[PDB]
Design a protein around this ligand. Structure first.
Ligand SMILES: Cc1cc2nc3c(=O)[nH]c(=O)nc-3n(C[C@H](O)[C@H](O)[C@H](O)COP(=O)(O)O)c2cc1C
Ligand SMILES: Cc1cc2nc3c(=O)[nH]c(=O)nc-3n(C[C@H](O)[C@H](O)[C@H](O)COP(=O)(O)O)c2cc1C
Ligand SMILES: Cc1cc2nc3c(=O)[nH]c(=O)nc-3n(C[C@H](O)[C@H](O)[C@H](O)COP(=O)(O)O)c2cc1C
Ligand SMILES: Cc1cc2nc3c(=O)[nH]c(=O)nc-3n(C[C@H](O)[C@H](O)[C@H](O)COP(=O)(O)O)c2cc1C
Lengths: 367, 367, 365, 367
């Protein structure tokens, strides 16, 4: 598998351009595993276009200067209101894999979420983190002792939160991967204990098939009880699931449609956030993902009831283009992009973003 | 007329790509008679885009595993909540014609709808069905006695329901077939008695022209009284017609716009379904059709008041690609497609689909 | 300028296709005069896309057979609920000019509307019409004598109604015509008295015509002529009130095929508010974008009594003289007949009562 | 830097065509500095498409002839209800630069707004104006004394209003300029004092960066007191900013989004105008800009609460193609374009425009 290996900073004009730039250096199967989505990708497009539904106001004479992007979540002080989403198999994008990403996230000054489907070991990722905060994202085994073992290993590594991803009990209908007969070109060491052999050579379909299908609210209770860490439930698009998760002992709600990689013909993730936030009613923090590309998207999420957002495909494409420094350039971009938005919207700090008026655009994308 | 004749299973990634595939092995005229619709096909596009007006939510920690697609309608146990739509002249798609389709439907474990405009005889279809359940779809004669005879032969053959299609008293404005000067290359044995001759060489316009124009609610009561079978009324897009039909003695409502092949500049069929379901108020079963291409569509139709859906074009395209095995592959695709959708929506059985919350998408297709 | 000249029937599958086909037989400048509209033609597209705002229902077991398309308007019995709209300089389309259209309209069995900016004389047109009804559409001279004379000539020739066109006091911003330096290649007998048209822009022609039309003008035309008067060009309900009050016997809802005010609604979208104001006081003619039987149906379900046909008939004339134009009318009649059968309508009155499905998603659905 | 120099009238069919025409005579970097906007320019498109949201009615038999376009604002009599927007660096478009634009505006008979980021000195512009009225647009220095001098200097030149442009406290995300590495090829003599060096070679990001970031309502107060002139606050899109501005001593409101060059993923300017006009409630005059390309636009804006509009890009494109004569030709087109719209909408004068009904188009651009 010919993953790129060059390490270098990159100029980011916008993150959209990074997709096509990455397509030229990443192998065809892996690239399309990363970039693609369910069906004909209408819900991926909806994730993007949802940002035009609520528009930002420039505000004038607001007595603002040098906006501050720092915030805090569950007692982590972070440099900007975003974190790194859990993403499988970073080796598809760059030879330095999750250790590359981890170094970038750490030196930038935010939180790394570690996928259970990582192609790096905890030891390898930890080398990249170099002390930096990490949250571990579990894809559950069917066997209870194996979940206890995985969670114990995650906690031993330093995780300060557990992310239960529950929107992938079976795979999405990912046409590109089907058409490409995509299989993983390397192992997944954290979960291989419950796979039939090694992830190498398996389809995602069958790896999710090995994970737990019959997730119930008791799993949230049990993960909380066992780990003693705050538990996020990830993949929420319906507000009743945020109330269920909280009542089952969740410490955070992670609004997401898995980057449109899961259920097809579903809403753009952003359009779901306000009802979710209204139901959460500030009981616990909210992480939002699925389609964040610009500082304006960071701002709009917060104004709509998120505390932080999670970043995904653009960081991975930066990773492809420049290893840890390319991924860092993308994080840096987002920080600067937000800073501009903060200044022009009249926002001095992060809490101010959460209070912004939004202009309703009933005409949608074509205006 | 060089119809395809190969029999084989086929890979279905999505049903949409089956159209272009079928186009390369079906003669130009018949292919376009199958794919085409009225006018510039805006209402066919509407049938497809309607599915984006109501969007599915993924649901989490639902305690669902191995969902069951099995259901029952008018006492028939079927393997999934879909049945075969009545479609004329399957020999246009495949040399094995309706006998091929029958075998696929029967082997799969659902209901075959026999079109009065079949190019195959009752016994030739019965061959392929091998004992499997069948519903007969009447295009009425003007002559009362010819209707009684057609119903008698249908019932004698084993029909357990009669379907009256009443949205075709004259033909739609099918631009492709006008431009191609399409005429049928074979005969229609069941309705031949009222054609003045044979369907071979006749336009569809003139075949519809020979059937009954002055259909009335008495026709429904007469068919129910004579056959002694439950009667569906097919073609309904307005709720008042549902009230009419039930009052006239129908045992089922079949919501359909005939694949957009009849009235032009009409709504997408799915958009008309909630109003008709509300009016029906569970008094009889509802079959929905016109635009079903995905398991998501099956789920949405049920969530919106349908009890089952009927499949059309994609099963025909499958028949063209690999005979009965080809059509079978299509049925199997829909079954697996729906199973995924059930798992991700939190539906353990088919009844749970009927209670799903849908997200309203007032932006429509471009979002 | 050489207009086509061939006469023949045509196979009309839809009217949209006739635009491109005609483009291949009409000289460029003239064809684009016929086909073009103001600005980037956004409002002409709006006229066409408005039809998807209200959708028809198929209706079943309606006990209907052999629908009847015939109707009546201000005493004239017609074979279908449409008439020919007034259009200028038909010789741009076909050598046989307004006489060819006349004959088509006449044999088909509906009413012809005569433009004052016609290229043919009353007499040339009357031979075409062969005993058939006609409405004269006036563009007003700034001088009263000339209006009296035109009106008498028009009633002398046989006009049974008068159409006041009031939406063209100055021209639309027609970019095609400006880019093409388009000028009329021949003359308009009926109005040259206030100008020859040959070699002048439409801007300067409208320039000569009356800019300060007022409600008085409608009273006067009714008075002088003693014939039922239509006010043509209306898109706002208040002008329907203004009109009826000044003695109009009919409202003609229209935006001039989008050849006039730009960035305005599609014409069909304006129709309900106007019909509601009119409150069946006088008959309503509707135009600006009818292309299908479905459109005739929707306009009638929406408060119109008949529609007027424009572009497609003229494309039909380009292609095949009188016989082509006739094929288009025959198309519309048979197209309407299908829609009636599928919608559950036995007759034209049934069309005016159809329920329509509201589509708030618009054209892309 | 190869600015065009030809001086000639031009036959404007529509303003949109001027952009491509100008692109062939203006140097690449400059041209794209002028034409471009923030991000993917979605908000520049929204500026343009907002015009289709409210549609004009033709009105008949209105007894109207020879519409009068002239109007009055803050005691200037002007020939049509539009003025010239303050735009930096006309030298990017034409060697005659701001003196050329000035002559056109002066001869047409309206007001010139002078950008603090002019490439021409007050004297050069004054020569072109030849006694014509002028408003000066300030980009604030951070140093108080220096603002006093700038305003003293503008007042001495004959400014009869000051325009505070407050939506540019930092630059928009102008991807064209980033990608072209645009820097100014000449100086800005008026603001040299606070760049402490030439603008030549500097980016717009660093120029804005030198102007004042922390603009507060007190700045508006201090400018109105020190200058004794009516102050406009420019860049307003939210109704609260209009309240704030009038409260702080402003004598006019200027609704603008900087032609989409500033905050991205914001509304189209016109959609913001009614709510601002309702809040202002005729207390001061309103100038509207950002996307006016047609006479129909000027009408719609006045019908929506504007007193006059400000014209930007189309005028500069004219200047590129014809120096002062080409710019003049643009002003002349607008005036005739408006005149046609007055006649057909039944508007005898400018006040009549302000009373026009508009048709609400909820279907937006695609209809
Ligand atoms: C290539 C890829 C791999 C992913 N793998 C995982 C995973 O292992 N675990 C998980 O919880 N989410 C995973 N996600 C979803 C991300 O956590 C996140 O929801 C998504 O990337 C947000 O969408 P965006 O990148 O389009 O903005 C993955 C997403 C991508 C694109
Ligand atoms: C090629 C073709 C032939 C059809 N023939 C019949 C028929 O003979 N009888 C009938 O009731 N409906 C007929 N229909 C309508 C089908 O019952 C069904 O309503 C339609 O196929 C649903 O649209 P879809 O197939 O695009 O989903 C036909 C449809 C197609 C495409
Ligand atoms: C080429 C052309 C010339 C026209 N000339 C006139 C005219 O002289 N007087 C008039 O009242 N309307 C005129 N109209 C407007 C028509 O009466 C009618 O309102 C228009 O054709 C409706 O649009 P449609 O043909 O696109 O359906 C003209 C239209 C066209 C296309
Ligand atoms: C090249 C260019 C330079 C501009 N420079 C300035 C400026 O120096 N000061 C300012 O207040 N506005 C400036 N603007 C904004 C204009 O004042 C005005 O808001 C804008 O041109 C209106 O948008 P439109 O030209 O697309 O109609 C500029 C706009 C452009 C395109």
């Amino acid at each position: 598998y010919n993953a790129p290996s060059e390490i270098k900073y990159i100029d980011v004009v916008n993150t959209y351009d990074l997709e096509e730039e990455a397509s030229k250096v990443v192998p065809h199967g892996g690239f399309n595993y990363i970039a693609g989505a369910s069906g004909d990708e209408w819900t991926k497009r909806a994730n993007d276009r949802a940002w035009k539904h609520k528009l930002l106001y420039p505000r004038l004479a607001q007595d603002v200067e040098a906006p501050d992007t720092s915030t805090e979540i569950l007692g982590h002080k972070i440099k900007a209101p975003f974190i790194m989403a859990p993403i499988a198999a970073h080796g598809l994008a760059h030879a330095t894999k999750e250790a590359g990403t981890a170094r970038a996230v750490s030196e930038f000054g935010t939180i790394m979420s570690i996928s259970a489907y990582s192609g790096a070991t905890f030891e390898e990722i930890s080398e990249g983190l170099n002390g930096g905060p990490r949250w571990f994202q579990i894809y559950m085994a069917k066997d209870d002792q194996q979940n206890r073992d995985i969670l114990d290993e995650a906690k031993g590594d330093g995780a300060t939160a557990i992310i239960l991803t529950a929107d992938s009990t079976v795979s999405g209908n990912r046409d590109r991967d089907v058409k490409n007969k995509f299989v993983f070109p390397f192992g997944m060491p954290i979960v291989q204990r419950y796979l039939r052999g090694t992830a190498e050579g398996m389809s995602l379909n069958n790896i999710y098939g090995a994970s737990k299908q019959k997730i119930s609210p008791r799993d949230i209770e049990e993960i909380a009880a066992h780990s003693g860490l705050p538990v996020f439930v990830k993949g929420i698009q319906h507000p009743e699931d945020a109330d269920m998760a909280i009542k089952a002992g969740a410490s955070g709600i992670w609004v997401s449609n898995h980057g449109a990689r899961q259920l097809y013909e579903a809403p753009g993730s952003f359009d779901t956030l306000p009802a979710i936030a209204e139901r959460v009613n500030k009981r616990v923090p909210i992480v939002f993902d699925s389609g964040v590309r610009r500082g304006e998207h960071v701002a709009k999420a917060l104004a709509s009831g998120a505390d932080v957002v999670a970043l995904g495909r653009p960081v991975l494409f930066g990773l492809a283009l420049g290893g840890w420094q390319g991924a860092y350039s993308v994080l840096d971009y987002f920080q600067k992009d937000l800073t501009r938005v903060m200044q022009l919207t009249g926002s001095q700090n992060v809490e101010d973003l959460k209070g912004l008026d939004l202009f309703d655009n009933p005409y949608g994308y074509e205006y």
